[PDB]
Write a protein that binds this ligand. Structure first.
Ligand code: FAD
Ligand code: FAD
Lengths: 472, 51, 468
């Protein structure tokens, strides 16, 4: 039953499924191969979607259970959590979106092959189903989008029961009394905050000195961390984890110590979440036999068109270099496939935004103060606090600020950093400004609707440009 | 011919015709840095070889 | 016995911002306010208290209804304490008005509390509430006297049962039945609020669509449909003959296309519109002519017939919005200082803060037809947006209108979640004369609502979205 094809996409994560849909829309005969029961990859099944759902639901639970609603005159007798139901709402979103991808595949005439894909030749891919049922695909182009997997922590073994990765953390059957998070990056903070809201006593342990992962702005990170602690989220930074052992009561002894040395102690938890990162997944894909070697971090090396060492074999997304983010993978899948149609292929990772969907939210795009200092770029700074923003105040949601970084003399926006309400959505306005090479003054002169959170974005740019804003 | 109010003001403030400045931004947009580059090449010019 | 470089009359979004900017640019600045608190219509009886109640009532609706239950947030009883809700509204308003005072202080703006009249081309006189006047000699005058509630011919507002905005914003109890006159932006917002709290709500509207002027009809239509499923009822293409206060306390309302009919309500809101407020200002006494509606005519620098006396905000032609007023104030004073002055109202966004929200900037479809422009249409539904879908909040769509020839964006229209914030990205794109294609190629964070906007532009440009 062999199949001929112009483009064969291995993996249906954000990178694969978007590249597949697009390849079909451009006229390519397109096959997409996926090993798991559903399409959509890490983002839709065990990543972005379920975490964002739990972040939403747990936030509302916090508002209800707390003082927020009562200050608003919404008096509720006795607020209780129904964790199963909450998890149901999360699964529903995942089901609908994963199913939606099958639908889009069908609508665009993308051929969906269910099985483990292995590149069995420069112009051939073979999918092996569970039952050993094989399926061969002869193709002009191969697009590798095989994604990423949990990076294991040496010594500690994940069982998705009481020692969990992000995957187990998203499906706990009950709120842990006490929970430790190994790693205070974007994902650890989000999942940590979720359970903390639901009643968990939570501590994140991080080897570096700041929360939020690489590229986050020091001042933004520090203010963020501070606010999280006020909420009850606990952090031990510049701290190393040496191991963990399962006690006889079921609880878990985690042993730590300063990253520099000593101060050895022991913290105990009911659930241990290992969240130190993710790494490229290329297992049994057949790169070895092809002579395509990896870089020292497991990533498939590619040129500016996303071509590997072998000109008709392409790679995109988490499995290659750059920010391991879903919108990054999608963009790459699009421009790569455009390239196969003779298009131009250009992406700049400095224009890729990041978001943390906690509350407050954190979002940024472009360059941080630290990245500017170490490149020897001369810059000015404008800041506006959400405390003086009308829609934020009116909602009594006033934590945080917008910080704009401009080139000292060209007024060129270099980076925009948001901590506070609506940051995730707001950073997209900043992204657009970067694409056009906006100057701080430019954004300051654009009429913004009032009252909106976005005015804080406007004001911050006004302060960077003119030295002064209006409402602060 | 593309240039924002702020860029148009800078040019006009320094008596620069927009037609004699090639942009470096998207689709040839003229950025502030282009006005500033021009203003700067205009001073160094008095020291370039001629006759 | 006091004088200045610039005297702004009125502390509205228009005047206060113009005041602060005037000061910052090196001008000895004075600002005059008849009312007890600063802020104007927006802060005291406008944007701020309505947004406050829209927030609190939206939350109430989620707690009281099916929403929180589906998320595994369970409650014994949900009771409204309307005094506390009103209190929260007030705290927001006190805080914001106080902030403006602190801002005048910080910027060395001189605040004068009194009803001001223009007595001389370079003199303004402010008569306090106790007679004791105060006079200002000034090189420049800026009129930002804003606007007032426009009365309904033969209906008598007593802010009791027949309330205007102000009244509707402070009701003491939830009305069993409520009738709104005018299904415009404000009218729908205030109706929704009380509709959420319990009220049986009905809006009656002369025109044949909810949303006021300029809203895209497709959007207006889906919006109305959606409000109706929430329980908000409409009588469109309907005239209000007049209102009859009855004896048992209720109020009969006379309505008709011409097919007469009468509806009874416990509270009646008169939200037919607003108009420039210019009473006892000294304009007639100075030779300044109005237009039929009552606005102060100005040129592209906002100056009246008298070249040193300017006007801005609601008291002028253009959309009666706070940010329109604030922008005008700024570019006006910049112009006093020898700067350039231009504002295109086609680039002023509009927002309705119901749920779902509605927001737009640029041209509706009708506008593009009525101007004979050749254009394309890209849409994208929030049902296919990951963020919307994950929050189970899927009503509405994004509509982009692009130019058939140049693929340039001409209008953006948003119905659904985050529309208010989202339109500001649309605004920024118009400023740069972005093509639909350019927007589609800007990396947007996933998962965000803003991706519907990215996709709608993709569809307008290429013919197809990815996710729909
Ligand atoms: C908890 C969590 C939260 C996250 N939140 C966000 C967020 O909020 N925003 C954001 O931008 N990113 C988020 N991410 C990161 C995001 O999920 C990844 O960047 C994204 O999934 C990358 O997509 P991809 O297509 O490159 O690879 P993947 O999504 O990992 O897809 C790879 C797919 O390929 C399949 N596959 C691999 N090998 C084979 C093979 N040999 N044969 C057949 N199929 C194969 C896999 O089964 C998988 O389906 C989150 C991640 C996690 C874990
Ligand atoms: C219920 C409601 C909700 C609204 N919501 C929004 C919204 O969400 N978004 C939006 O953009 N707009 C909204 N608006 C409209 C907005 O309030 C106005 O467009 C805005 O107030 C315009 O400000 P302004 O400075 O031009 O005039 P105003 O805000 O009305 O301020 C004028 C001030 O000048 C003072 N004044 C007038 N004459 C004199 C005088 N002779 N001497 C001294 N002082 C004087 C008045 O007392 C007044 O305080 C809303 C309006 C209402 C009624």
């Amino acid at each position: 039953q062999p199949i001929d094809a112009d483009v064969t996409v291995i993996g249906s994560g954000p990178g694969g499924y978007v590249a597949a849909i697009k390849a079909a829309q451009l006229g390519f005969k397109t096959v997409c191969i996926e090993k798991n029961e559903t399409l959509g990859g890490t983002c839709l099944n065990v990543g972005c979607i379920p975490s964002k759902a739990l972040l939403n639901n747990s936030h509302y639970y916090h508002m209800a259970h707390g003082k927020d609603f009562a200050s608003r005159g919404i008096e509720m007798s006795e607020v209780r959590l129904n964790l199963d139901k909450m998890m149901e709402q999360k699964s529903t979103a995942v089901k609908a979106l994963t199913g939606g991808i099958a639908h889009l595949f069908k609508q665009n005439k993308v051929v969906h092959v269910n099985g483990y894909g292995k590149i069995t030749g420069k112009n051939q891919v073979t999918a092996t189903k569970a039952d050993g049922g094989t399926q061969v695909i002869d193709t002009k182009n191969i697009l590798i989008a095989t994604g990423s997997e949990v990076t294991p922590f040496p010594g500690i073994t994940i069982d998705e029961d009481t020692i969990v990765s992000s995957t187990g953390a998203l499906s706990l059957k009950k709120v842990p009394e006490k929970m430790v998070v190994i790693g205070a990056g974007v994902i650890g903070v989000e999942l940590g905050s979720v359970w903390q809201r639901l009643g968990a006593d939570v501590t994140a342990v991080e080897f570096l000195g700041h929360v939020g992962g690489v590229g986050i702005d020091m001042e933004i990170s520090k203010n963020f961390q501070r606010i999280l602690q006020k909420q009850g989220f606990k952090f031990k930074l510049n701290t190393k984890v040496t191991g963990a052992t399962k006690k006889s009561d079921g609880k878990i002894d985690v042993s730590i110590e300063a990253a520099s040395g000593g101060k050895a102690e022991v913290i105990t938890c009911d659930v241990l979440l290992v969240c130190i990162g993710r790494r490229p997944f290329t297992k049994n894909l057949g790169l070895e036999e092809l002579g395509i070697e990896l870089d020292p971090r497991g990533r498939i090396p590619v040129n500016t068109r996303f071509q590997t060492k072998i000109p008709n074999i392409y790679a995109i997304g988490d499995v290659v270099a750059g920010p391991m983010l879903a919108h990054k993978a999608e963009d790459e899948g699009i421009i790569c496939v455009e390239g196969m149609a003779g298009g131009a292929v250009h992406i700049d990772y400095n224009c890729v935004p990041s978001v943390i969907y906690t509350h407050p939210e954190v979002a940024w795009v472009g360059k941080s103060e630290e990245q500017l200092k170490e490149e020897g770029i001369e810059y000015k700074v404008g800041k506006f606090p959400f405390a003086a923003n009308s829609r934020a105040k009116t909602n009594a949601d006033t934590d945080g600020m917008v910080k704009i970084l401009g080139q000292k003399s060209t007024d060129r926006v270099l980076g925009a950093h948001i901590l506070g309400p609506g940051a995730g959505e707001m950073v997209n306005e900043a992204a657009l400004a970067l694409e056009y090479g906006a100057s701080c003054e430019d954004i300051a002169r654009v009429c913004h609707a009032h009252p909106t959170l976005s005015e804080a974005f406007r004001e911050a740019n006004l302060a960077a440009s003119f030295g002064k804003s209006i409402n602060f | 011919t593309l240039a924002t109010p702020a860029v148009r003001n800078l040019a006009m403030e320094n008596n620069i015709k927009l037609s004699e400045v090639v942009g470096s931004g998207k689709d040839g947009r003229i950025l502030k840095e282009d006005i500033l580059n021009y203003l700067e090449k205009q001073t160094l010019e008095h020291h370039h070889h001629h006759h």
